[PDB]
Each structure stands twice: as structure tokens, then as C-alpha cells.
Design a binder for this molecule. Structure first.
Ligand SMILES: *[C@H]1O[C@@H](C)[C@@H](O)[C@@H](O)[C@@H]1O
Ligand SMILES: *[C@H]1O[C@@H](C)[C@@H](O)[C@@H](O)[C@@H]1O
Length: 113
């Protein structure tokens, strides 16, 4: 009794919901399975195909902070600024916006005036 392949199983769904992945389907050497010294089934027991979905969301990421602006003062109470860019990367395909402020403030040179 030589082995015989069962019918293919239904194709699975895409391995991913976005971007590229694969759909798989399987067979069993059980229709009939091989007996002792009978020929085993010839071929593949699994078949992986490829599926392509829409691009995955790209969440925003902050770029480097700009250098601190020079202090508005040399003694008592200064305020210097600093800025950011949400373009490393820029949000795309429904990705989340960067979290946080685009600009930063801080007191400086607050000392003996
Ligand atoms: C599965 O992957 C996530 C990241 C989103 O792209 C969903 O829309 C998709 O179903
Ligand atoms: C700037 O502030 C003035 C008042 C002086 O104290 C300078 O020495 C400082 O750089």
C-alpha cells in the first residue's frame, strides 16, 4: 500500500494584516498512509504562498533637539528655547503622532546678577 495525499486543507489567512506575509495550506500522507515498505507520498506537505496587504502605519518619531537658544540674560533670570521636529520618521498611513512638545523652555544663568 503506497501512500496517497489527502486533499489540501483550506488556505489560511494572511500572516499579516499589513505589509507582506504568506498564506499556508497543508496535506497529510494519510489517504492512504503508506504501509510497511510501501512508497511514501511524493511532494510537499505544506504550501506557503504570498499575500500583500496595505502598508503598515508608521508612527512619528522625534528628530534631534536643536541646540539651546542663547540665554536671554547673563545673571538673574534667563529663558532659553529649544525646538524639535516630528519627522524621524513623519507619521504615515495612520501612524501615531509624536508624543510631547515641539518646543522646550528653561530658565538659565539664574545666578548672582
Ligand atoms: C494589522 O497590523 C496592524 C499594525 C494594523 O496595520 C492593522 O490595520 C492590521 O489589521
Ligand atoms: C550680563 O548681565 C550684565 C548685567 C553683567 O552682569 C554681565 O557681566 C553679564 O554677562
Amino acid at each position: 500500500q503506497d501512500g496517497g495525499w489527502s486533499h489540501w486543507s483550506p488556505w489560511s489567512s494572511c500572516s499579516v494584516t499589513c505589509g507582506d506575509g504568506v498564506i499556508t495550506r497543508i496535506r497529510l500522507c494519510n489517504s492512504p498512509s503508506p504501509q510497511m515498505n510501501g512508497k511514501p507520498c511524493e511532494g510537499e506537505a505544506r504550501e506557503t504562498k504570498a499575500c500583500k496587504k496595505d502598508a503598515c502605519p508608521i508612527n512619528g518619531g522625534w528628530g534631534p533637539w536643536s541646540p539651546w537658544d542663547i540665554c536671554s540674560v547673563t545673571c538673574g533670570g534667563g529663558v532659553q528655547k529649544r525646538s524639535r521636529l516630528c519627522n524621524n520618521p513623519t507619521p504615515q498611513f495612520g501612524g501615531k503622532d509624536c508624543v510631547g512638545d515641539v518646543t522646550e523652555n528653561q530658565i538659565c544663568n539664574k545666578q548672582d546678577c
